[PDB]
Design an enzyme around this catalytic site. Structure first.
Site, short mmCIF file in Angstrom:
data_model
loop_
_atom_site.label_atom_id
_atom_site.label_comp_id
_atom_site.label_asym_id
_atom_site.label_seq_id
_atom_site.Cartn_x
_atom_site.Cartn_y
_atom_site.Cartn_z
N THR A 7 0.83 -1.20 0.00
CA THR A 7 0.00 0.00 0.00
C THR A 7 0.86 1.25 0.00
O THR A 7 1.77 1.39 0.82
CB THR A 7 -0.94 0.03 1.21
OG1 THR A 7 -1.82 -1.09 1.17
CG2 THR A 7 -1.76 1.31 1.21
N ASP B 81 -2.65 4.15 -4.35
CA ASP B 81 -2.53 2.96 -5.18
C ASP B 81 -3.78 2.09 -5.04
O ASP B 81 -4.43 2.06 -3.99
CB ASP B 81 -1.29 2.15 -4.82
CG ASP B 81 -1.29 1.69 -3.38
OD1 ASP B 81 -2.14 2.15 -2.59
OD2 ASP B 81 -0.45 0.84 -3.03
N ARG C 83 -4.26 -1.35 -5.48
CA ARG C 83 -4.24 -2.78 -5.21
C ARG C 83 -4.35 -3.06 -3.72
O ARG C 83 -3.76 -2.37 -2.89
CB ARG C 83 -2.97 -3.43 -5.77
CG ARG C 83 -3.00 -4.95 -5.63
CD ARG C 83 -1.77 -5.65 -6.18
NE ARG C 83 -0.57 -5.38 -5.40
CZ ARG C 83 0.66 -5.69 -5.79
NH1 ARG C 83 0.85 -6.30 -6.96
NH2 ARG C 83 1.70 -5.41 -5.02
N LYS D 235 -8.84 3.87 -2.38
CA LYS D 235 -8.30 4.25 -1.08
C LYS D 235 -8.62 5.70 -0.73
O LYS D 235 -8.80 6.02 0.45
CB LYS D 235 -6.80 4.00 -1.04
CG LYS D 235 -6.45 2.52 -1.08
CD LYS D 235 -4.97 2.30 -0.88
CE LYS D 235 -4.65 0.82 -0.80
NZ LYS D 235 -4.72 0.18 -2.14
N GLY E 86 -3.40 0.69 5.90
CA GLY E 86 -3.47 -0.06 7.14
C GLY E 86 -4.34 -1.29 6.98
O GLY E 86 -4.50 -1.82 5.87
N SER F 23 2.98 0.75 3.16
CA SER F 23 4.14 -0.13 3.10
C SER F 23 5.20 0.43 2.16
O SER F 23 6.40 0.24 2.38
CB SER F 23 3.71 -1.52 2.65
OG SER F 23 3.19 -1.49 1.34
N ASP G 270 7.69 -2.02 -4.77
CA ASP G 270 7.13 -2.63 -3.58
C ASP G 270 6.22 -3.78 -3.98
O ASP G 270 5.57 -3.73 -5.03
CB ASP G 270 6.36 -1.61 -2.74
CG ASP G 270 5.89 -2.18 -1.41
OD1 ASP G 270 6.26 -3.33 -1.09
OD2 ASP G 270 5.15 -1.48 -0.70
N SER H 83 2.13 -2.82 -3.31
CA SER H 83 1.49 -1.76 -4.07
C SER H 83 1.43 -2.16 -5.53
O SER H 83 2.41 -2.69 -6.07
CB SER H 83 2.24 -0.44 -3.90
OG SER H 83 2.19 0.00 -2.56
#
Lengths: 199, 244, 204, 219, 240, 246, 235, 231
Positions: free
Chosen positions: D1, D17, D19, D33, D47, D129, D166, D169
């Site tokens: 994330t 993002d 996903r 989001k 989170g 993240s 990452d 994400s």
């Protein structure tokens, strides 16, 4: 995290660093650890930010009623106790640590360490995890009866020594000079930071 | 009906045959029992409060007797009504004003402070357990958007902002003079407003107030903090009443 | 984990004007079977169903609460429930349990009562609503059912092709799962009618 | 994330993002989001999935009561207090990490709220993240007083560097621009990986289904 | 006709009678006075002796709320002992919360609010106790605040609570107490009370006085033996 | 607490009859007239409408006829306000039964469950009672079709044919004469209910807007609750009007 | 007539009628007296007989070793206060490990009996009391009331026709300080007889006493122990 | 605590006495008219002040409950602020659970159930406010009337306040179908002219509309446009 306060004739100089770090990574690079509880009263945050910002807001509230109901500026001893009661009551849950420094029409400049639910008045006070390294600078270089121009140079030199040794401290120094006339908020940028032994 | 009473309607607060509420009617009469009057005039950049200040005995301390309170730094207040009930709402207004800043994180606006006060006086109207308060609050202040603000709160729970207000013993007659000057639409400055506001009381009471017979709270765009004019500052505006 | 105690599988795939929901019939305790008659798919009324997976206690516990809250909602309102509103109900039902969560992952499939509009979605232990335009799966075999539904699914399909697609999606995904099996029940929700079929699957 | 935010001359811009993953799988490839708090105020959850959603629902509902009660444009400093005192009330058990931003008449303001209640005002920030990737791109290319046309690329390049670098994400990049007029939402503004093609259809002819119990219920 | 049966009802003229009736409970109570000077605040009270059987000092009407705060009550003493105990809870909550001496202006507020909360409801009765609070501080000075059954607080140079007021409030106006010193005030306080006190209904009393000011370094005390005897004799010599 | 203002709603009368219960029945006495008839197949509810105007929308449903459960329904005669509180309670009671036992609630079990709520308000609490007396219809796996009539005191019972509301006394006297035990059919019951109302209507001609009929039948193992539309209602009236002369 | 029925209703004269009527409950019961010397403090209570066949009520109750009370009022209502006083005296020895000061114990009663006078729907305790105790400041005799107002007294008399017993105590007040154990008790015994008519005298059955002093704990003499004090006093 | 006993009881005649007089309070309140026609529902209330010192922007009768719902009143003024603050929560409590705007039928059902709670629960009087709740849902407008008793209706057109009997009579002879929101605002203001006495300016009359665009209160400049008797 490094916070500092020095007492002189007209008022107090409240220094602090900026960087806020969770673990070995830096959450916030520039962060203001001085949160005014009242016009002339300033609190230097330390420890857990989530716990300190809660105590600093609860202390800014309970004290706000104290300011309105008395129709008079509260003392610094009043601000240090509101912080102490919140810190000692929750001391299991809240790991926060604060420092209260300011000026009043009665006793003048004051500085109170609130650490872990206790209370002291101190001529100069240092706090945070970065405090420990500057316990030799503040013992030697400190002299009683310093002018405001000397105190700001003493607080600036001291924190600048803490930011270099501490990994959890760094960034720009904040300096708030609180006197009877008002509050002078300065910022010491990295190019103005006093240079000390490099190696 | 036209005044007919059925049962307990006149004792607690419940509907009568004519639908009115007599307990709230009598709360309006608890304002006139205060034995005083107050006027708050809203100028262009300023909002001025002029309060009749009665100190009949010399033993009474003048510094501790005031109807002008400070709810928060930028919001003034003048309480016309029962002196006991006045300090009841002021202590409650200060809690609501501070609780507003503990939740919403900014100084409460004047219009929304009269709303949370008038909504509490609605609780006392429905619940038959207790009586409404007998004090009528008049708040002034300046919001950074709408400028100067003058609001009023009756014990019934009905709050409305006015251009120029009145309260206490003399109201209708005190408003009759306010209809004269506001209709003419003079240019309102800090000195022009206070001179007219003080004249408003003098025309009704036929006095020509002395410096110690009044206290004047003022708030301006230049001076957002609520301030009370000292006896010296008051007398500076009293000589202007010798003029125009 | 705990949701792997009784196993179980639930699948939903959206077609063009129709949706299809399927689940297996097996009820067992860890490594031991008990009965093949267990019911993981429950009617919410005409053209709307909900599947449930995870611990078999919460499958019947959460379901009896929905028919409790649904029948209240349908009697208060003058209309049948929308499938989108039902997603938020089960999300609110599971989120109130946040600190003592039911163990289950609801799978909702049905048709908007307006005209033709199909809807599907899936949830979590905490009930985060998740709306997808293709398919949703839940269970211990979920990892299997992803790969099967990815390759087979297409944007628009008539009812005949949904059944063939969701049948082979479950049958092949369950055969590689140890705690699921013992036959599969497949429901088909059309605009006109509803077709229920119990497949003949490997008994193992 | 990965979620991020940026302050420019006239306003703020909030990216996110799309996903969402549970354990290691991709549960949904398209997810919002960025939530809606006030007309000129938004926010980005990172989170626990529902803890970052239900939380912004309570704030979006409280700010609607507050906006109808006062009749005034919602202040960004107010939303931060509501999210700050709600998350601290739960002692960090909720894992919602939020970035609140918007333009009131005080001027552009961008906050960030950590799961334990720690909130800092600042020009730019990123959470989630992939926060370490996005912040590093913000640090280098930032500079005060940016025009809007140059402020979109720096945020897109901030999140794209957080997606491609990452495992938590992915998907498209949502962006929300706020100005004095405000309330301009751009959904799926950037697509770092275009190709998604899957040609070899496995569609087969009906008629092989060892089915038994078939029945039909008319409606 | 029924409008005065509870504190929750307004008269058709707007007055709350149950609060006005609690004030008459003070009008029948004995007279107590208080006074400010340059040096500090002085108290005085007429404590009536109902029978010789009562020990000297019983039914003491001068309460110490805090070290630096004195209190003098006129009214029903049953409710007074509740206020003095609740006023101590406010001074101790202040000492606990804010960790220093409670300013008299703030202590006369919280208490005057508690007295007020019982005039609103129908489940309680208004206090019948009127009382004044004096205090002294080097950073504040002589302060005197009266509270009545309705919860109204005013500052005074001198005041009279209880039965005799207009008689005692005229006798205080004649003397100028602003520049005088506390040691010369004590002699005048007792002089006022004996002039105010007339024996028709009641019989005898015990003069009670209090020091707060520069002489006591801020700690509220009762007047010591020698000074109380020094002050009482002067009022007897000045009696005629 | 100020007793003076307390009216003592739960006390007995000198003759041993609760006041607020008797005065509630006079509120129901002037309310809308409802009746029901139990036949061999199906049970019906005929509700008169006392609110009629050109400006009324008629947006919802049968307007005074509710639906408690899939297998049951109810009409209402009494205060229209308090009926919405009971209905929301009856819908919780049937769904708490269905939650534990996973079967439809029998009519005997649902009625006696609500009358416990009508007791708590008459016995204690000091709050006023409910001004709503109800009719009940439904079917269960045991005793078949059921018709129950409660009251504000919580006193119910089974009935073959009953009536409630305005002119409820004059209607029952008509049912007792015409109603035949076991010989009534839904086709002969509908023709009966119309003849009973047409005499008890305060407004003649029996417009299709005033009286509205709701019938309950069981078909294919499923209970069917239908409210007759104004088209079919007027058709039954005209068939009854020709039988008065022709 | 409307002002009578409630405790929280004032009057036009500022008088609470129910608290006044609760004072009448003290005048409806047996008279009790007590007085203190420089050392001892002795309570003397007259136990009333419902009949000659039935026994006498207990008008004196233990509280703590150094503290005792004489109840005049509603009997079962005084056991609510006595149970409160016993818990306060045990909590003083359990916490501070010291005998509770009598001036403190009476102050806690003033707080307990004040609440029912304040609140609506409750009644003031209809029991008057004399608390005799000994502490570091010397013996004490404290009177209470239903109005919650408590006094500090050399000697008092409460109950039916107590005014006459109060008049007796005033004349001999100067002698109360130097009396020994025996003579002190005799002062109170002479007070009771003044309250009752001459047709009734003092007997071992109907009179109970208690004594607290410097070296002596509070003790109740029931019947046979009352006789040695009764003998030697002319009536 | 407080009074736990119900202040509303059945009269010997069988009619609740409290509510009967609560309907006598709304008869003397501010005249309020509303019309459900075609695609919108107009609500026009006459706000009549006693002075030129009263600031108009401070107080508004017409208030939104939510984006799709709006509300006026005729009756006790302060009591109206209690329902609105309750109605705005019920619309949010609905929107949190079901994630959709509350339908007017369900809101009037819950609001009128709160107005029933004060006809039973003790120590409270019923409201003195008779609501008009306009709503737009599923392309179908909603005009409901909740009264103090808690019994809500559904009206095509209705009038409240002073001369509400004379208000409804004027509606029958005027109101019809195929009546645009335009003509609705016209016919709404025309009814007040028979009720209100004196000149009617943008400060005297307060109008609002609810349609597919959502509920919005007309600004005085826009109200002045309709005061030309055009539209």
């Amino acid at each position: 995290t490094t916070i500092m306060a020095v007492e002189f004739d007209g008022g107090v100089v409240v220094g602090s660093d900026s960087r806020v770090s969770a673990g070995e990574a830096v959450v916030n690079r520039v962060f203001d650890k001085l949160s005014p509880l009242h016009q002339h009263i300033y609190c230097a945050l330390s420890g857990s930010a989530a716990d300190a910002q809660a105590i600093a807001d609860m202390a800014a509230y309970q004290l706000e009623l104290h300011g309105m109901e008395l129709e008079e500026p509260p003392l610094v001893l009043a601000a240090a106790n509101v912080v102490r009661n919140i810190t000692y009551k929750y001391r299991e849950d809240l790991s926060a640590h604060l420092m209260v420094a300011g000026w009043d029409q009665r006793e003048g400049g004051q500085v109170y360490g609130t650490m872990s639910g206790m209370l002291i008045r101190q001529p100069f006070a240092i706090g945070g995890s970065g405090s420990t390294y500057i316990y030799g600078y503040v013992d030697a270089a400190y002299k009683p009866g310093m002018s405001p121009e000397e105190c700001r140079r003493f607080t600036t030199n001291a924190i600048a020594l803490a930011m270099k040794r501490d990994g959890s401290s760094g960034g720009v120094i904040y300096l708030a000079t609180i006197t009877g006339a008002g509050v002078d908020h300065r910022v010491i940028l990295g190019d103005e930071l006093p240079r000390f032994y490099d190696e | 009906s036209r005044g007919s009473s059925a049962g307990f309607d006149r004792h607690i607060t419940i509907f009568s045959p004519e639908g009115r509420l007599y307990q709230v009617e009598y709360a309006f009469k608890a304002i006139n029992q205060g034995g005083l009057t107050s006027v708050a005039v809203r100028g262009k950049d300023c909002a001025v409060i002029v309060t009749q200040k009665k100190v009949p005995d010399k033993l009474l301390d003048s510094s501790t007797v005031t109807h002008l309170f400070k709810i928060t730094e930028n919001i003034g207040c003048v309480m016309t009504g029962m002196t006991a009930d006045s300090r009841s709402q002021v202590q409650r207004a200060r809690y609501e004003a501070a609780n507003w800043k503990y939740k919403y994180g900014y100084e409460i606006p004047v219009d929304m402070l009269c709303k949370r006060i008038a909504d509490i006086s609605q609780v006392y109207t429905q619940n038959a357990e207790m009586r409404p308060l007998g004090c009528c609050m008049i708040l002034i202040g300046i919001d950074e958007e709408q400028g100067p603000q003058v609001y009023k709160c009756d014990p019934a729970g009905y709050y409305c902002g006015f251009k120029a207000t009145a309260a206490g013993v003399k109201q209708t007659e005190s408003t009759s003079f306010l209809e004269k000057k506001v209709k003419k639409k003079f240019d309102w400055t800090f000195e022009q407003t206070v001179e007219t506001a003080i004249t408003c009381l003098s025309t009704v009471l036929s006095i020509d107030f002395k410096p110690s017979e009044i206290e004047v709270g003022v708030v301006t765009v230049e001076n957002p903090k609520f301030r009370i004019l000292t006896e010296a500052e008051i007398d500076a505006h009293l000589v202007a009443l010798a003029e125009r | 984990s705990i949701m792997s105690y009784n196993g179980g599988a639930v699948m939903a795939m959206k077609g063009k004007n129709c949706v299809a929901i399927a689940a297996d019939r097996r009820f067992g305790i860890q490594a031991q079977m008990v009965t093949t008659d267990f019911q993981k798919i429950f009617p919410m009324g005409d053209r709307l169903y909900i599947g449930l997976a995870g611990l078999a206690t919460d499958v019947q516990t959460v379901a009896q609460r929905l028919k409790f809250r649904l029948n209240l909602y349908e009697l208060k309102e003058g209309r049948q429930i929308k499938p989108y509103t039902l997603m938020s109900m089960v999300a609110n039902l599971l989120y109130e349990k946040r600190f003592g969560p039911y163990y289950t992952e609801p799978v909702i499939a049905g048709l908007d009562p307006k005209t033709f509009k199909p809807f599907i979605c899936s949830l979590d232990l905490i009930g985060c609503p998740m709306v997808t335009d293709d398919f949703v799966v839940s269970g211990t075999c979920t990892e299997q059912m992803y790969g099967m539904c990815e390759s087979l699914w297409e944007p628009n399909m008539d009812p005949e092709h949904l059944f063939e697609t969701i049948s082979q999606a479950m049958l092949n995904a369950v055969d590689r799962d140890a705690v699921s099996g013992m036959g599969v029940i497949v429901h088909i929700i059309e605009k006109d009618k509803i077709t229920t079929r119990t497949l003949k699957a490997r008994m193992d | 994330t990965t979620i991020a935010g940026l302050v420019f001359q006239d306003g703020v811009i909030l990216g996110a993002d799309t996903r969402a993953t549970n354990d290691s799988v991709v549960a949904d490839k398209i997810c919002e989001k960025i939530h809606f708090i006030a007309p000129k105020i938004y926010c980005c959850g990172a989170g626990v999935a529902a803890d970052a959603e239900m939380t912004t629902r309570m704030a979006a509902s409280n700010m609607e009561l507050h906006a109808l009660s006062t009749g005034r444009e919602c202040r960004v400093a107010t939303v931060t207090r509501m999210l700050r005192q709600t998350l601290f009330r739960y002692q960090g058990y909720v894992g919602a990490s939020l970035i609140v931003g918007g333009v009131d008449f005080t001027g552009p303001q961008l906050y960030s709220v950590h799961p334990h209640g720690s909130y800092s005002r600042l020009p730019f920030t990123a959470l989630g993240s992939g926060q370490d990737a996005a912040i590093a791109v913000l640090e280098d290319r930032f500079q005060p007083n940016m025009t809007l046309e140059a402020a979109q690329e720096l945020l897109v390049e901030a999140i794209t560097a957080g997606i491609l670098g990452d495992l938590g994400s992915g998907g498209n990049v949502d962006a929300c621009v706020i100005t004095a007029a405000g309330a301009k939402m751009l959904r799926a503004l950037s697509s770092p990986t275009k190709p998604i093609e899957r040609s070899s259809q496995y569609r087969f002819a009906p008629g092989t289904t060892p089915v038994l119990s078939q029945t039909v219920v008319p409606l | 006709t029924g409008y005065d049966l509870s504190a929750s009802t307004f008269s058709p003229d707007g007055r709350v009678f149950q609060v006005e009736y609690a004030m008459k409970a003070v009008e029948n109570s004995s007279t107590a006075i208080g006074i400010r000077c340059k040096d500090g605040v002085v108290f005085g009270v007429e404590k009536l002796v109902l029978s010789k059987l009562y020990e000297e000092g019983s039914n003491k009407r001068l309460f110490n709320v805090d070290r630096h705060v004195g209190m003098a009550v006129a009214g029903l003493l049953a409710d007074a002992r509740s206020l003095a105990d609740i006023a101590r809870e406010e001074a101790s909550n202040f000492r606990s919360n804010f960790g220093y001496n409670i300013p008299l202006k703030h202590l006369a507020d919280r208490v005057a609010m508690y007295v007020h909360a019982y005039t609103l409801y129908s489940a309680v009765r208004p206090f019948g106790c009127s009382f004044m609070l004096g205090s002294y501080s080097v950073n504040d000075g002589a302060q005197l605040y009266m509270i009545d059954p309705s919860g109204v607080s005013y500052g005074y140079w001198g005041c009279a609570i209880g039965k005799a007021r207009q008689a005692a409030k005229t006798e205080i106006e004649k003397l100028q107490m602003k520049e005088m010193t506390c040691r010369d005030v004590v002699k005048e306080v007792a002089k006022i009370i004996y002039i105010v006190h007339d024996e028709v209904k009641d019989k005898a009393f015990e003069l009670e006085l209090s020091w707060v000011g520069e002489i006591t370094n801020g700690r509220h005390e009762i007047v010591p033996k020698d000074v109380r005897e020094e002050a009482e004799k002067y009022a007897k010599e000045s009696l005629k | 607490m100020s007793r003076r203002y307390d009216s003592r709603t739960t006390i007995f009368s000198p003759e041993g009859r609760l006041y607020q219960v008797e005065y509630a029945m006079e509120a129901i006495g002037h309310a809308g007239t409802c009746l029901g008839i139990l036949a061999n197949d199906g049970v019906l509810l005929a509700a008169e409408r006392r609110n009629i105007h050109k400006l009324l929308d008629e947006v919802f449903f049968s307007e005074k006829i509710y639906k408690l459960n899939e297998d049951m329904a109810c009409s209402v005669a009494g205060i229209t306000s308090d009926a919405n509180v009971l209905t929301n309670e009856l819908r919780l009671i049937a769904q708490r039964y269905l939650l534990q036992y996973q079967e439809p609630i029998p009519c005997e079990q649902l009625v006696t469950a609500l009358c416990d709520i009508k007791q708590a308000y008459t016995q204690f609490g000091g709050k006023r009672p409910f001004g709503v007396s109800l009719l009940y219809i439904g079917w269960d796996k045991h005793y078949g079709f059921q018709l129950y009539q409660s009251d504000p005191s919580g006193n119910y019972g089974g009935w073959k044919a009953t009536c409630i509301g305005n002119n409820s006394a004059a209607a029952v006297s008509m049912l007792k004469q015409d109603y035949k035990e076991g010989e009534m059919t839904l086709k002969s019951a509908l023709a009966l209910a119309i003849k009973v109302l047409n005499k008890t209507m305060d407004v003649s001609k029996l417009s299709a807007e005033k009286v509205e009929i709701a019938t309950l039948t069981r078909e294919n193992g499923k209970t069917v609750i239908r409210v007759l539309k104004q088209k079919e209602v007027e058709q039954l009236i005209k068939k009854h009007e020709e039988e008065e002369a022709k | 007539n409307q002002y009578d029925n409630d405790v929280t209703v004032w009057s036009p004269q500022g008088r609470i009628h129910q608290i006044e009527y609760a004072m009448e409950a003290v005048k409806q019961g047996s008279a009790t007296v007590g007085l203190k010397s420089k050392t001892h403090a002795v309570l003397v209570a007259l136990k009333r007989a419902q009949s000659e066949l039935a026994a006498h009520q207990k008008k004196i109750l233990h509280v703590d070793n150094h503290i005792g009370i004489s109840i005049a009022g509603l009997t079962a209502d005084a056991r609510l206060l006595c149970n409160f006083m016993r818990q306060e005296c045990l909590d003083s020895r359990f916490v501070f490990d010291r005998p509770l000061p009598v001036s403190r114990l009476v102050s806690l009663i003033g707080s307990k009996t004040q609440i029912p006078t304040q609140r609506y729907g409750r009644r003031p305790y209809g029991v008057g009391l004399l608390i005799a105790g000994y502490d570091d400041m010397g013996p004490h005799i404290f009177q209470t009331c239903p109005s919650a107002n408590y006094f500090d007294c050399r000697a008092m008399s409460i109950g039916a026709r107590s005014q006459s017993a109060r008049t007796y105590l005033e004349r001999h007040m100067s002698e109360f300080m130097e009396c020994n154990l025996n003579e002190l008790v005799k002062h109170g015994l002479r007070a009771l007889r003044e309250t009752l008519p001459a047709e009734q005298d003092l007997t071992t059955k109907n009179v109970s006493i208690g004594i607290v002093g410097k070296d002596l704990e509070f003790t109740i003499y029931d019947d046979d122990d009352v006789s040695p004090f009764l003998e030697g006093l002319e009536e | 605590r407080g009074y736990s006993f119900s202040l509303t009881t059945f009269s010997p005649s069988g009619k609740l006495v409290q509510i009967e007089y609560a309907l006598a309070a709304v008869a003397g309140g501010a005249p309020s008219v509303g019309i459900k026609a075609a695609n919108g529902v107009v609500l026009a209330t006459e706000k009549k002040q006693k002075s030129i010192l009263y600031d108009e922007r401070s107080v508004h009768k017409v208030e939104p409950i939510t984006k799709h719902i709006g509300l006026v009143y005729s009756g006790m003024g302060p009591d109206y602020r209690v329902l609105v603050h309750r109605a705005r929560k019920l619309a949010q409590q609905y929107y949190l659970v079901y994630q959709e705007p509350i339908p007017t039928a369900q809101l009037v059902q819950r609001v009128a159930s709160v107005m029933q709670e004060y006809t039973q629960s003790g120590g409270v009087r019923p409201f003195g406010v008779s609501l008009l709740i306009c709503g737009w849902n599923e392309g179908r407008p909603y005009l409901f009337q909740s009264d103090p008793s808690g019994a809500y209706f559904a009206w095509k057109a209705t009038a409240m306040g002073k001369n509400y009997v004379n208000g409804k009579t004027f509606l029958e002879k005027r109101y019809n179908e195929d009546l645009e929101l335009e003509d609705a605002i016209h016919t709404a203001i025309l009814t007040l002219k028979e009720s209100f006495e004196g000149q009617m300016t943008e400060d005297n009359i307060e109008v609002g509309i609810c349609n597919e665009a959502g509920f919005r209160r007309l600004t005085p400049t826009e109200v002045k446009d309709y005061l030309a008797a055009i539209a």
